Paper text:
Arg406 is a component of the CPHGRP motif and completely conserved in all MutL endonucleases including human PMS2 and MLH3, the nuclease subunits of MutLα and MutLγ, respectively. Arg406 of aqMutL corresponds to Arg847 of human PMS2. The R847T mutation has been found in Lynch syndrome-suspicious patients and registered as a variant of uncertain significance at the ClinVar database. The R406T mutant form of the aqMutL CTD was crystallized in the presence of cadmium ion, and the structure was solved with the Cd-SAD phasing. As was expected from the CD measurements, the overall structure was almost identical to that of the WT aqMutL CTD. The distance between the M1 cadmium ion and the W1 water molecule was 2.57 Å. However, the position of the α4 helix, the local structure around Thr406, and the quaternary structure were the same as those of the zinc-bound form of the WT aqMutL CTD (respectively). These results support the notion that the M1 cadmium ion fixes the side chain of Arg406 of aqMutL, causing the shift in the position of the α4 helix and the change in the quaternary structure. The DNA-binding ability of aqMutL was not influenced by these mutations, whereas the endonuclease activity was severely impaired by the R406A and R406T mutations. The R406K mutant form retained significant, albeit weaker, endonuclease activity. These results suggest that the Arg residue in the CPHGRP motif is a catalytic residue for the endonuclease activity.
Numbering used by the authors:
A (entry chain A), B (entry chain A): 0, 325 to 425
The structure:
């Protein structure tokens, strides 16, 4: 994700929505914190058990911290168990569906 | 869209994001206001020219009014010119990508 981005908020207390000029990302809060903790601790089970779970509301500040850190991970793409950390939509698919150039 | 829904906000001053239990909708603010005005006025050119344009920031209240009215349109799907009013993502595609049931 590009360095200029806009955080749109939490969805279902499970995903952080954040976009740059190319994609809208839906970032799984548990998988992201688990990757952050795993890269620090190098322990898959420990990183999992201490991380936030889906269904927890997160503050705006905590959300900003997580997204900032996501960009600097060695592996921002998959958690230690191999699950994708996020789903992404190219913004072009949204614009093109309504007939707008992008 | 179901009667219980959550408005997530504006994106790029062009789309309103709103979700129910099944889909996340990206609603083109211009196409929606144009449909609202067209169903009232029955004049395609008039409805277009008086409607909000992309690139205008909208207040939370105006966004609530638009989404409420969208649900009650005779044709909530396409504008008078035939363009889709919105793009939709099934929530299952977001959850399934990160390995979550939905
Ligand atoms: Na351990
Ligand atoms: Na006219």
């Amino acid at each position: 994700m590009k360095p200029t981005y806009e955080i749109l908020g939490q969805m279902d207390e499970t995903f952080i929505l954040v976009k740059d000029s190319e994609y809208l990302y839906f970032v799984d809060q548990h998988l992201l914190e688990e990757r952050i903790n795993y890269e620090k601790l190098k322990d898959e089970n420990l990183a999992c058990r201490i991380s936030v779970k889906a269904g927890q509301k997160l503050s705006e500040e905590k959300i900003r911290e997580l997204i900032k850190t996501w960009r600097n991970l060695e592996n921002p793409h998959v958690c230690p168990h191999g699950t994708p950390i996020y789903y992404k939509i190219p913004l072009r698919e949204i614009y093109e569906k309504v007939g707008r150039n992008y």
